[PDB]
Design an enzyme around this catalytic site. Structure first.
Site, mmCIF file in Angstrom:
data_model
loop_
_atom_site.group_PDB
_atom_site.id
_atom_site.type_symbol
_atom_site.label_atom_id
_atom_site.label_comp_id
_atom_site.label_asym_id
_atom_site.label_seq_id
_atom_site.Cartn_x
_atom_site.Cartn_y
_atom_site.Cartn_z
ATOM 1 N N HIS A 102 0.803 -1.225 0.000
ATOM 2 C CA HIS A 102 0.000 0.000 0.000
ATOM 3 C C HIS A 102 0.836 1.275 0.000
ATOM 4 O O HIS A 102 0.288 2.356 -0.230
ATOM 5 C CB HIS A 102 -0.928 0.033 1.216
ATOM 6 C CG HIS A 102 -2.149 -0.822 1.081
ATOM 7 N ND1 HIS A 102 -2.771 -1.398 2.169
ATOM 8 C CD2 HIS A 102 -2.860 -1.203 -0.006
ATOM 9 C CE1 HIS A 102 -3.828 -2.078 1.759
ATOM 10 N NE2 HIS A 102 -3.894 -1.991 0.443
ATOM 11 N N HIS A 327 -9.332 9.991 -0.005
ATOM 12 C CA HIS A 327 -8.473 8.834 -0.086
ATOM 13 C C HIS A 327 -7.202 9.049 0.727
ATOM 14 O O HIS A 327 -6.428 8.102 0.927
ATOM 15 C CB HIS A 327 -8.164 8.530 -1.565
ATOM 16 C CG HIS A 327 -7.512 7.203 -1.795
ATOM 17 N ND1 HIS A 327 -6.143 7.057 -1.906
ATOM 18 C CD2 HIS A 327 -8.037 5.966 -1.969
ATOM 19 C CE1 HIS A 327 -5.852 5.786 -2.120
ATOM 20 N NE2 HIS A 327 -6.983 5.102 -2.164
#
Ligand SMILES: O=C(O)c1cnc2c(C(=O)O)cccc2c1O
Length: 438
Positions: A102, A327
């Site tokens: 990630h 986000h």
């Protein structure tokens, strides 16, 4: 400003809310440096789009894509990159199940030095179009003269910590970037690196990663104040993992305990969690499709309805971004009246055990499944006791921290529900006239 914390540009807000924002084309522009080589750490890549974001004169310089894809997903990414002879790929090892890569980071090697960019966006058009995303931009780090023996280290130990993060990959393409970093002077860095890497850490390694890394930094480099129990913890994220059957399993037992650490001494601390409601998503600039990037599943959510009483709406009038779904992920420690903060973290890490780690083996081992990366702003690293909160994100003493959403956070109303991406919403249409039928 000393903080170099930016939001991405949002298509559709008035120019005053993009004046101090950055698009990826701005970051890769020749005004930031004459590119020699770059490494793009990320999760999701659109390689055709990505190459077009580099200036035309730089589009044939070497690019390394660092990813976590396996099997057919790996094949698809290789096929995307095969038309570009200058693109190499590095598959991050993911030996623990359900882990992902990630981390979102650019390493930018210039003729003039080196820059590090740690951010929250995938390398796809939609992540830079109408979302709230965060960017930290390092200074231009000069090269250390050949023959000179200097550490090039900062008071926050950023150089050693970034090398340690890259060493964890055990990858030949990243040893090349480690050697580049060794050759540059990063002493001007005023943020602390907080990373996650996959593994099971005990003993001398327990404090290296995840929420124990945060706890260690807060014990060593922050001070406890009187009435510290009244300073809330705020967490703001775009996905939630399975946290257990009640708050004592992980959320308020080890996660919150790390986040409420201040100073070296031996809880009713309020915990605010910010996560978009269905209404937030429906009325957003993207409409319901924004929920494609908020992947909270009904299977997970139905197992932890206790969690949703902690949830607060997304609101960002301060940066004109109430309709630009988040986000970015951020965590911070505001004062009881939300006028000051004891620290601020921007990161790729969502509210999950995979990202932050979970204790195992009678509390002696921290197990992390995923790669994550963020930077921590501590007042002590700027010669301060606390940060004043900037009242308007893009407005005008530069020692006030630009928090990108509104404080105090607003609790969900009784009719609000958390955005859950794999159930239908057919009662009211979104800003484009559509329903959501997964
Ligand atoms: O940026 C990230 O780290 C990330 C990771 N995963 C997803 C998923 C998924 O897990 O299927 C769905 C939609 C968006 C994301 C996303 O944005």
């Amino acid at each position: 400003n000393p903080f170099q914390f930016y939001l991405t540009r949002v298509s559709g807000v008035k120019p005053k809310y993009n004046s101090g924002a950055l698009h990826i084309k701005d970051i890769l522009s020749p005004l930031f440096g004459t590119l020699v080589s770059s490494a793009q750490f990320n999760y999701c890549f659109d390689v055709d789009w990505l190459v077009k974001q580099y200036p035309p004169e730089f589009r044939k310089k070497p690019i390394l894509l660092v990813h976590g894809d396996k099997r057919e997903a790996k094949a698809h990414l290789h096929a995307q990159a095969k038309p570009y002879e200058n693109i190499s790929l590095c598959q991050a090892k993911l030996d623990i199940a359900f882990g992902t890569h990630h981390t979102k980071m650019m390493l930018l090697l210039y003729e003039e030095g080196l820059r590090v960019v740690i951010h929250t966006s995938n390398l796809i058009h939609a992540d830079w179009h109408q979302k709230t995303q965060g960017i930290w931009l390092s200074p231009l780090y000069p090269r250390i003269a050949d023959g000179t023996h200097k550490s090039g280290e900062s008071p926050t130990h950023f150089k050693a910590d970034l090398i340690s993060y890259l060493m964890a990959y055990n990858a030949p393409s990243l040893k090349e970037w480690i050697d580049v970093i060794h050759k540059h002077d990063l002493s001007e860095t005023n943020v602390y690196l907080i990373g996650s890497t996959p593994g099971r850490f005990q003993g001398s390694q327990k404090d290296n990663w995840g929420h124990f890394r945060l706890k260690k930094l807060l014990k060593d480099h922050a001070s406890s104040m009187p009435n510290a129990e009244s300073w809330p913890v705020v967490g703001q994220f775009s996905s939630v993992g399975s946290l257990g059957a009640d708050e004592s399993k992980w959320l308020c037992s080890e996660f919150k305990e790390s986040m409420l650490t201040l100073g070296k001494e031996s809880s009713s601390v309020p915990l605010y969690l910010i996560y978009p409601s269905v209404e937030n998503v429906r009325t957003s600039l993207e409409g319901y499709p924004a929920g494609g990037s908020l992947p909270y599943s009904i299977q997970t959510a139905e197992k932890q309805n206790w969690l949703h009483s902690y949830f607060h709406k997304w609101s960002a009038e301060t940066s004109g971004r109430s309709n630009a779904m988040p986000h970015i992920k951020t965590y911070m420690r505001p004062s009881p009246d939300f006028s000051k903060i004891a620290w601020f973290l921007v990161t790729s890490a969502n509210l999950s055990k995979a990202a932050w780690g979970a204790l195992e083996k009678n509390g002696t081992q921290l197990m992390i499944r995923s790669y994550e990366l963020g930077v921590l702003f501590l007042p002590s690293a700027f010669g301060l006791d606390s940060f004043k909160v900037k009242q308007k994100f893009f407005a005008g003493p530069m020692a006030t921290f630009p928090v990108p959403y509104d404080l105090p956070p607003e609790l969900y109303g009784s009719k609000d529900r958390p955005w859950i991406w794999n159930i239908p919403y057919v009662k009211a249409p979104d800003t484009h006239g559509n329903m959501w039928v997964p």
